[PDB]
Amino acid sequence: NVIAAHKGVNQAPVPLKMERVGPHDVHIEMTAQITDIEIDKGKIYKAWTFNGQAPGPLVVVNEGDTIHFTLKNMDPVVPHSMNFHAVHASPSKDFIDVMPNKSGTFTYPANKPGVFMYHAATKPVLQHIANGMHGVIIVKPKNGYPTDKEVDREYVLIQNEWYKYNDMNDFQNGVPSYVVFSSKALKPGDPNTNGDTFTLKEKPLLAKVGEKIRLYINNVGPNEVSSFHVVGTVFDDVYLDGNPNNHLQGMQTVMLPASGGAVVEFTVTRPGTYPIVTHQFNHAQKGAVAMLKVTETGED
Amino acid sequence: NVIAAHKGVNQAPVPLKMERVGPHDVHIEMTAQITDIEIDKGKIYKAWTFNGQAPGPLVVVNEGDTIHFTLKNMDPVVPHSMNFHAVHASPSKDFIDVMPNKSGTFTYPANKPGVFMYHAATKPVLQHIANGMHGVIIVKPKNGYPTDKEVDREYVLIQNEWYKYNDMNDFQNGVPSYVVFSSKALKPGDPNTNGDTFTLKEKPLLAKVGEKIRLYINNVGPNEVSSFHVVGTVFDDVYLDGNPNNHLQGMQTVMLPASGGAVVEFTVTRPGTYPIVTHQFNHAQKGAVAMLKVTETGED
Amino acid sequence: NVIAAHKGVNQAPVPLKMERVGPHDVHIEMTAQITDIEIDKGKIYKAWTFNGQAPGPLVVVNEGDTIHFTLKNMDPVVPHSMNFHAVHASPSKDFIDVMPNKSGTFTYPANKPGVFMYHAATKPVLQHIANGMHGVIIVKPKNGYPTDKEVDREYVLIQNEWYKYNDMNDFQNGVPSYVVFSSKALKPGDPNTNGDTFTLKEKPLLAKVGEKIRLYINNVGPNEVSSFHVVGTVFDDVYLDGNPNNHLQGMQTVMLPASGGAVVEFTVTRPGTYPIVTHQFNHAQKGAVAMLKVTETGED
Ligand SMILES: O=N[O-]
Ligand SMILES: O=N[O-]
Ligand SMILES: O=N[O-]
Ligand SMILES: [Cu+2]
Ligand SMILES: [Cu+2]
Ligand SMILES: [Cu+2]
Ligand SMILES: [Cu+2]
Ligand SMILES: [Cu+2]
Ligand SMILES: [Cu+2]
Ligand SMILES: [Cu+2]
Ligand SMILES: [Cu+2]
Ligand SMILES: [Cu+2]
Ligand SMILES: [Cu+2]
Ligand SMILES: [Cu+2]
Ligand SMILES: [Cu+2]
Ligand SMILES: [Cu+2]
Ligand SMILES: [Cu+2]
Ligand SMILES: [Cu+2]
Ligand SMILES: [Cu+2]
Ligand SMILES: [Cu+2]
Ligand SMILES: [Cu+2]
């Protein structure tokens, strides 16, 4: 199922570009590009990506920022596009296709705090998402969260599925071959990984005994819901979609729809390694287990 | 899988009958009937229906109304019945079968505000729901919703699946062949459609730039959950099951169980066409995309 | 797929042992054992169990109790282990394997009120859960629930799936063969059953006309979410995961993730038999229907 013009194509990752251009305005430039990603050991997926990552690079803006977004399409033959769930926009004017070897710029406001999916909007959308064109944009709430002062350390996790390569029958009708977590960096030194079955097991996220950890999470799908759970703890506080008003306490497991987000916070009380799962254990068995290593110092 | 006595049967739609009979009492009369519905282009499903619609006709009552419900069974051979999720009733006395060519009347109160599924209760219930015997009853809250004064325009949407015709193995064990939206009229001039893959794409719901839209939504299944999302906006306010107390804000996507309802409200800020999806994109690809056309005047 | 050392093995159920050892400390002793369970009429599953029950025996503790848990592994060849979702623990030190014919003791606090899953933690966790090593621990809130004084009668229900026997391909990739409810006793005289397709239909839970019923519920999976609904009523109050803060009202149906819990309360207004379902009707058809028989006296 490899398009003739994609045979042998493996475009090197290109860094995300972002710069603030006013107190409430931010420029973002991404690419659409075709990049080989190792999704399981020995298994390469020639993914349709933003910037050579799948999920794509993390975007963080402030509530009330208007985003001036440019997509540079490096794919030699397939059009691509961008839909941010954070924004208010006209889909038929602002989420439109950018043709091969062209760029397009679109402007829209991020009025709402939270942890939002982004993805390509090009028909068939299922094909673009399943092939890798998904990601997260975080919109920071103007007044924070009521538990901000309690949080010691924070990371971003994203859940996605992988199917048989570019196979629309499988995408529509088949079980996922792999379900995976990735982490995207918020601060210098944080890991930045792609959706694969192994990296966050072999290179766990790090924390220190006694810390309260915040995770910004989103299940991008394309197709499955997620039963998000951290082994050995309970979520002290949960904010559905990352909106501070949607505040639950003491949850064992957080139900995420496809594209669903949350801010979750939990305390790690003892040294050890703590798995992070979707509790739909067929999906966990097919890759969706990450690890958090908790040490007396927070160092590995 | 077509029952001998249903071969060639296509009973014309019969209008819902409703009339208020007291300040807190309402008569409703439906039929059970066998009616051909075009669920995808060129694909007829000889559905088991209420009133020749699938999902069935919309019912709207007020909180505290007692419903005096009559079902007239026009099916020549299969018994049918009615279960309203809105009501408090004895299932074994009030949700019982009405035999072919007979009628039955049942009385029960709708004590709780919200957006409730209704469906046939006849064993096997899966068979009756999958073949088309589902619908929505809205119970209006005595004191409204706190955001009532902000809403400019409102519609009803229902999600359902379609399987291989009357195939209990497929109903139990197979993926849906189609997943679809329909709209049911609240006010004169609103569309009133059946669950199909195309009508709400070709004849979009209409709105005006700047409006706040309310949707009353229910995912009737039979089998899937729904990740309900409007492209190009964020839900300002969500009331789970349509109960005013269950109030979320700023949600990108609303997780609906099978039979789950909600009242969702969102603002459309720019002219254009806005898709409405379940974000489980396998289901969207198999039909579950509706459209909302937003114009400077609200006219098409 | 029957391990040689399990052929012909059917270890008799062993009672749960629990005793309070201080105002905030409780001893619990379970077994891991291999026991034949009739999951559907004529269908024996040689389950991997705690104490010869699947789901395992109910555990009830108070918020703030530290649990001193001993597992005695009676399996001749497979290691087993215990993970309580209620507790804060080091998974790599406290949820570790107990080898055949050995015991292990682990101590950890239950700081959070609610209705929590427990299950084996031994890799592959999917295999242990699917084969029967799941259950519920209830942690009673120090200050109760705000609706405690309204509740007349209470029971515990658990939902689980069963797959082809010890078949990891089916566990990962196949639909469940059966989906089932069981009830676990809270007070003397309550039923105590295993996850099967028939017992709670033939021997319904009992209640009296006019009562408000509380159910403590958990969907242990392993793989499916649950759309929990009681026919003929509406949930007056719902507490997600059994935490009193997570308070919804007037829900028709409660969405439970895999491992998700709730406390749900509803009123039965008329004599009759009331089905209890997951509204994902493929699962209901494959076993997941229990019954509640409501009489003028509450006696059968
Ligand atoms: O909490 N691990 O299923
Ligand atoms: O927001 N369309 O996936
Ligand atoms: O309420 N029985 O689907
Ligand atoms: Cu300013
Ligand atoms: Cu600019
Ligand atoms: Cu694309
Ligand atoms: Cu989207
Ligand atoms: Cu701290
Ligand atoms: Cu915790
Ligand atoms: Cu009155
Ligand atoms: Cu009457
Ligand atoms: Cu019917
Ligand atoms: Cu129902
Ligand atoms: Cu307005
Ligand atoms: Cu919006
Ligand atoms: Cu004390
Ligand atoms: Cu002790
Ligand atoms: Cu085990
Ligand atoms: Cu678990
Ligand atoms: Cu009472
Ligand atoms: Cu009720």
Author numbering:
A (entry chain A), B (entry chain A), C (entry chain A): 16 to 315
Can you quote the paper on this entry?
Copper-containing nitrite reductases (CuNIRs) catalyze transformation of nitrite to nitric oxide, which has impacts on geochemical, agricultural, and medical health fields. CuNIRs typically have an ∼110 kDa homotrimeric structure, like a Reuleaux triangle. Each protomer contains one type 1 copper (T1Cu) and one type 2 copper (T2Cu) site. The Cys residue forms a peptide-bond bridge (Cys-His bridge) together with one of the His ligands at the T2Cu site to transfer the electron to the catalytic T2Cu site, which is coordinated by three His residues and an axial water molecule.
Since the GK-like conformer complicates the interpretation of the T2Cu site structure, we constructed D98N/G136A and D98N/C135A/G136A mutants. The structures of D98N/G136A without NO2- and D98N/C135A/G136A in complex with NO2- were determined at 0.96 and 0.99 Å resolution, respectively. As was expected, Asn98 does not exhibit the GK-like conformation in either of the G136A-containing mutants. However, NO2- again shows several coordination manners in the D98N/C135A/G136A structure, indicating that the GK-like conformation observed in the D98N/C135A mutant is not responsible for the multiple conformers of NO2-. The first conformation of NO2- in the D98N/C135A/G136A structure is the κ1-O mode that is observed in the native T2Cu site. In this state, the distance between NO2- and the amide N atom of Asn98 is 3.2 Å, which is identical to that between AspCAT and NO2- observed in the neutron structure. The second binding mode is the complete κ2-O,O coordination in the vertical mode. This state shows a shorter distance to the side chain amide N atom of Asn98 (2.9 Å) than that in the neutron structure. Because the complete κ2-O,O bidentate mode is typical of the D98N mutants, the hydrogen bond with AspCAT is necessary for stabilization of the κ2-O,O mode. The third binding mode is the κ1-N mode that is also observed in the C135A/D98N structure.
